[PDB]
Amino acid sequence: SSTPFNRKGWDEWDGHHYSRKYMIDDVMNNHLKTGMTYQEIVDLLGKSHYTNSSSICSIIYDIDVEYKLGDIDPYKGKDLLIEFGKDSLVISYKLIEWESG
Amino acid sequence: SSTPFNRKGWDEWDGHHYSRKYMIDDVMNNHLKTGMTYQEIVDLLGKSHYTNSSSICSIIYDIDVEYKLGDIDPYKGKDLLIEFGKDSLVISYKLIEWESG
């Protein structure tokens, strides 16, 4: 199932952001462009899950997370990686699939 | 190949931290324990690649990164995820394998 991005659904949270997996395709195809500013990204998607701040700037939005029944922690998921270059402009963005254990 | 952790090798950098993949097993088996403080982790491993700061605190060390010949960006890698709970104590740590595209 694939649905258009909306910010309410993007923001919905219960343990994880459980509606983002439905709109990631629209986000990447139809909303993300190289050349957007950091501020534009934050305006669109809100605050990221990870950052490399604290000279490429890099942020990560959780997209999907999957659990085994009875496990506190998840064994796989999907992330959205957005990288910024000069003038705080988007230089790349990609979907990351990860697994643990 | 698997070698003991040393901090010089852990720190070595050329594009990525290219010696960490050899010592990650020793790090997880023999140096990481739940209950260590945030400060102890930073003393051992230095500064992480990602953080969720900027109430679980979460940090990520790049362990390994792989590239296709002629590609600016990598298509897969390995990360070390360390999660902190109360009193800034380690509550879990795991190896993350990721891929893109």
Side-chain angles (χ1 to χ4, degrees):
Chain A
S1 164
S2 172
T3 63
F5 169 86
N6 67 86
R7 181 51 178 283
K8 179 189 185 186
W10 182 261
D11 286 347
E12 288 187 316
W13 190 89
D14 189 356
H16 66 111
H17 288 114
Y18 56 84
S19 292
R20 294 185 179 182
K21 59 182 174 223
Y22 299 124
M23 53 188 79
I24 184 55
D25 290 329
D26 186 53
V27 163
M28 299 198 56
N29 294 334
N30 296 321
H31 298 265
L32 299 182
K33 304 179 175 189
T34 51
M36 288 172 70
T37 71
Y38 180 75
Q39 183 58 250
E40 289 181 301
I41 295 298
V42 168
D43 279 339
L44 180 72
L45 306 175
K47 274 299 313 143
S48 64
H49 187 14
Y50 291 101
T51 173
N52 74 335
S53 291
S54 211
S55 64
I56 309 285
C57 174
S58 200
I59 66 179
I60 302 173
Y61 295 84
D62 53 301
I63 295 312
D64 194 14
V65 170
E66 292 182 65
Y67 303 85
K68 296 289 174 185
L69 199 61
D71 284 355
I72 175 58
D73 62 297
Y75 69 106
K76 69 187 279 188
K78 287 145 202 50
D79 288 324
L80 168 62
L81 167 75
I82 306 173
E83 298 205 318
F84 300 83
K86 283 323 149 284
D87 301 316
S88 309
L89 299 198
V90 172
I91 63 177
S92 73
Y93 48 92
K94 47 209 300 220
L95 195 52
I96 302 308
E97 302 196 1
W98 63 268
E99 181 161 5
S100 71
Chain B
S1 164
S2 172
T3 63
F5 169 86
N6 67 86
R7 181 51 178 283
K8 179 189 185 186
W10 182 261
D11 286 347
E12 288 187 316
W13 190 89
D14 189 356
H16 66 111
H17 288 114
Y18 56 84
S19 292
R20 294 185 179 182
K21 59 182 174 223
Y22 299 124
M23 53 188 79
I24 184 55
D25 290 329
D26 186 53
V27 163
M28 299 198 56
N29 294 334
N30 296 321
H31 298 265
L32 299 182
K33 304 179 175 189
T34 51
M36 288 172 70
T37 71
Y38 180 75
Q39 183 58 250
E40 289 181 301
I41 295 298
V42 168
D43 279 339
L44 180 72
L45 306 175
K47 274 299 313 143
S48 64
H49 187 14
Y50 291 101
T51 173
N52 74 335
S53 291
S54 211
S55 64
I56 309 285
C57 174
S58 200
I59 66 179
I60 302 173
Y61 295 84
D62 53 301
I63 295 312
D64 194 14
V65 170
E66 292 182 65
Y67 303 85
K68 296 289 174 185
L69 199 61
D71 284 355
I72 175 58
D73 62 297
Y75 69 106
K76 69 187 279 188
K78 287 145 202 50
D79 288 324
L80 168 62
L81 167 74
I82 306 173
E83 298 205 318
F84 300 83
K86 283 323 149 284
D87 301 316
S88 309
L89 299 198
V90 172
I91 63 177
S92 73
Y93 48 92
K94 47 209 300 220
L95 195 52
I96 302 308
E97 302 196 1
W98 63 268
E99 181 161 5
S100 71

